[PDB]
Structure formats: C-alpha cells, structure tokens
Amino acid sequence: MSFELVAYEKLKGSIRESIITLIKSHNEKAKIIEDKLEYSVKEVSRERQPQVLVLLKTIELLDNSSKEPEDKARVLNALAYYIRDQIAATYKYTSPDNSDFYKSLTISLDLNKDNNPNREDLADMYSALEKFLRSHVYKNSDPRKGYLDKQPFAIKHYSVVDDILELSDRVHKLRHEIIIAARDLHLLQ
Amino acid sequence: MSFELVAYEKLKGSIRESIITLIKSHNEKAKIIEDKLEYSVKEVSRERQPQVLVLLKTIELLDNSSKEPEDKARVLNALAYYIRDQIAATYKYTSPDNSDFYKSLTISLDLNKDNNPNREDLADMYSALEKFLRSHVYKNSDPRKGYLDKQPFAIKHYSVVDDILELSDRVHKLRHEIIIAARDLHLLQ
C-alpha cells in the first residue's frame, strides 16, 4: 500500500473547486472573484475559515516559488491530507464523510484502499510540509535566527507554529515506528 | 554560553588515554596492545565495557571515514558528551565526579561554566551522532532498506538501535524547545 502524489496543478484546481462549492453551500449568490478567492472565505464556517485560508496561502506561495513540480505537489498533497485528518479527528462516533469538504479532500487526493499513504509516505509528506511552513515563518527556516517580518501564515484563528510542532511530532513518531518495524523484520527473518 | 568542539585527533587521544587508565585501575599490569585496545576491555566493569567498545568502534570508523575533520570531531564530541550524560544519570544523589571516567570525559571535552553545549549545540551534536550510527546500521542509513549484513555496533550489552531512538528523541525535544523559545522571544520583544 503506497500513495501516488496528485500532480500539483490538478490538485490546486480541485481544492479551489471544493472551496468555491463550500462558499456556495452557505450563499448560493456569492460573487467569486477568481484571483481573490480568499475574500469570499467569510462565507464559510468559523471552523473552516483558517483551513481554507491556509490552503489558499499555501497555493499562492507555491505558485510564487521556484520549486520543481514534484516538490510543489508533495507540499500541497501533504497539507490537504493533514487538514483532512484534522477534520476526521473532530468526528468522535460517526463518519467524517458527513463533511462535504472532507469528502472533497478524499476525492481530490484520489485516496482509496490501494492508494493511501504508508508511514514512509506520511513521514516524507509531513516533513516537506513542516519545512515549507518553517521557510515562511523563520529567517532561513531556522527559528534560532528569529521570525520573518512578514508572516504570510498569520491568519486569524490559526497558529502556524502549533502546526509546525504538531507536524514535527507526527514525523518524529512515524520515524520511530519505521525504525521499530525494521528491527522486528530484522530479528524475525 | 556555547560549546567549541574539541579537535578530533586530540579528543581521540585523550579518550584513548582515559580508557588505558580505566583498564589499569583494575589491573596495573594489563598489557596494552596499542593498535588493539579493545582486547583489554575485559578488564573494566561490565557497565563500562559497552561504553568503551562503542567509543573505540566509533573512533575506528571515523578514522576509516572520508569525513572532514570538523564532522569527525562533531561525532566524537557528541558521543563523549552522550556517554558522560549517561553516567551522570546513574548518580541519583551524589556527584558523578565520583566516577574517574566521568571526570575524564568532562576534562577531554574541556567543559566549563562558559564552554558548555547550548540546546542548539546539543541538537547539532546528537543529530550528527544519530546519523552516524544509522550510517553503520542500515543500508543507505535508511531503516526502510534494512540492516547492513555487517554490524560494527553489534556489541555485547549494547543496543545501537536503542541509542538511535534515544538520540532521535533528544534531538526532537531540543528542536521543540528551540521553537518554543523563539516564539517567546517573538511575542515578548
């Protein structure tokens, strides 16, 4: 079981489409400005607002980056996957499919029984995402050197540093598990 | 407060000298073969045996490596510092200076009130040490790819994988703390 990254342009497109649909599910008459989707974000629930703005800021920054297509894809796939998981965690006894946005993330990512991230994949994805965020929070991505004067991720009801720590924790746990699994495979061969 | 790495040859020399002294503290007549110090390790306590063998194997591997002097130094300093800390943890209410080997590690490292590793230093040291060990346990340093057929660190009463996990945990915690401290500096400027 392994995950193929969705190509960046395609994923960008389907995420933007799902955001438009989310906006319209609250207000069918919303006037969408194509190159200013963030201005319509006020239409979605307080809970979804920062997730949407982080996705859109991520897309704007990657679009302006010098990154190669696969690295751009790895970042956007990782964030979509992460936000999807964040929504799943808010459901304590029924399906997260109850959230149309959740469903749209599953679809955008083309997730299915045979196409789904293993520990390695997740470690690579979340690591790339964590690096990306650090690159847009700290001088030289290095918190020792302080914060950038301009904080693209200073978004209301969002803590980019909380996300960096969390992503770092998941990566750390995933790398731990990979080591442990290799040990068991070694000793039990 | 920052730590200057001790140059590799010098550190190698003083660690080898302290090992000889440790051996001789049990058996004043021990016959030391210069290029085979590990054969004399049987003379030290069961507890010190794996620490000594890991230090000596580390030195042999660095000596055979293509590493630049500063990277060699970073690895050896890190391991000496780590083993020193491991000994300190075995003292629950009196000074670890009670251990002559502990004292020798403090001296070899030239540790003092103004020359002592900060979080950054430790993070860099333990990371370099963890990488080094992985490079001598797994194919391409990558546990996903399995274990090397030859395990230089398969040393009795020692688990190199336990050490990789532990080093990884300390690095993870140190990086966490660095982030947290940068945040407080940011918000409290």
Residue numbers in the entry:
A (entry chain A), B (entry chain A): 1 to 189
Show me the paper's own sentences about this structure.
Among all bacterial pathogens, Legionella pneumophila maintains the largest known set of translocated substrates, delivering over 300 proteins to the host cell via its Type IVB, Icm/Dot translocation system. Through detailed structural and functional analysis, we show that metaeffector activity derives from a diverse range of mechanisms, shapes evolution, and can be used to reveal important aspects of each cognate effector's function.
Strikingly, neither protein confers a measurable growth defect on its own. To explore this further, we solved the crystal structure of Lem14, revealing a small, alpha‐helical protein that forms an anti‐parallel dimer and is structurally similar to another effector, LpiR1, whose molecular function remains elusive (Beyrakhova et al, 2016). A citric acid molecule was found inside a positively charged pocket at the ends of α1–4. Lem14 has a positively charged pocket that is required for SidP‐Lem14 synergy in yeast, as mutants that reverse the charge (inset) alleviate the SidP‐Lem14 yeast growth inhibition. The synergistic effect of SidP and Lem14 is dependent on the SidP phosphatase activity and Lem14's charged pocket. Co‐overexpression of wild‐type SidP and Lem14 caused a sicker than expected growth phenotype in yeast, but any SidP or Lem14 mutant alleviated this effect. While revealing the full mechanistic basis of SidP‐Lem14 synergy remained outside of the scope of this current study, the uniqueness of this pair and its linkage to our earlier work warranted at least some investigation. In contrast to the SidP‐MavQ interaction described above, the synergistic interaction between SidP and Lem14 does not appear to involve a physical interaction as tested by the Y2H assay and LUMIER. Providing further support to an indirect synergistic interaction, we observe clear cross‐species synergy between L. pneumophila Lem14 and SidP from L. dumoffii in our screen. Indeed, together with our suppression data, the observation of SidP‐Lem14 synergy makes SidP a remarkable hub of effector activity within the eukaryotic cell, likely linking SidP/MavQ host lipid modulation with the as‐of‐yet undiscovered function of Lem14.
